[PDB]
Design a protein around this ligand. Sequence first.
Ligand SMILES: NC(=[NH2+])c1ccc2[nH]c(-c3cccc(-c4ccccc4)c3[O-])nc2c1
Ligand SMILES: [Ca+2]
Ligand SMILES: [Cl-]
Length: 223
Amino acid sequence: IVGGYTCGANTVPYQVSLNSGYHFCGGSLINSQWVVSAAHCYKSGIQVRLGEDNINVVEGNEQFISASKSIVHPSYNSNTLNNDIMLIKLKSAASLNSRVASISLPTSCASAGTQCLISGWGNTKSSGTSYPDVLKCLKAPILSDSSCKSAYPGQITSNMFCAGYLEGGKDSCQGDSGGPVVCSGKLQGIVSWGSGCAQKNKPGVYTKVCNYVSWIKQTIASN
Ligand SMILES: NC(=[NH2+])c1ccc2[nH]c(-c3cccc(-c4ccccc4)c3[O-])nc2c1
Ligand SMILES: [Ca+2]
Ligand SMILES: [Cl-]
């Protein structure tokens, strides 16, 4: 997260860190046994880390659970990143409390101008690599479809939306992929891609979760 602030320990209880010996992507807990992340974060040997704040120190509240299976959307396209969503089933259910809690899936899509909270342990520099130890947060609005398409002509599908600031300075970045974009208490987006980080007129692009709710429900119900 570039230009964001320190969230504060366990203030984003649905945030998870996907770990394979280091933090490589974020995710969102949607129930005690399932996490939603981005398809491009897929790899084998994923350990899901819940209740984290400093990812390099065991401070208490952490729950480390191995993924039992990861389900990348069948129509995921790695070249366009269309359908960049994945579900991860946990080997055992997580213990939910005030520090570890799930986030609700939306019933309707959000409108441009909606303010959302984006969080993660990704890079904090637009020009360089600085990864934080604790969780960073950023409040950002969803942009209109015309501004998004004007920024990335020919690259936005109906399963994506832009959120951020066109002036640059505040944005999600590498390491934040797969994490949550929460608006009014509902998970509306998944950090997916962008051109660099926090560059002027190049906002972040997110997977539009409202388009996948029946898919998520049906997939969880059959696995
Ligand atoms: N400007 C942005 N809002 C933005 C958002 C997510 C990004 N994710 C990345 C990204 C860059 C290089 C590699 C990965 C990557 C690839 C495979 C697995 C995990 C991360 C990224 O997600 N850049 C990103 C830029
Ligand atoms: Ca920790
Ligand atoms: Cl277009």
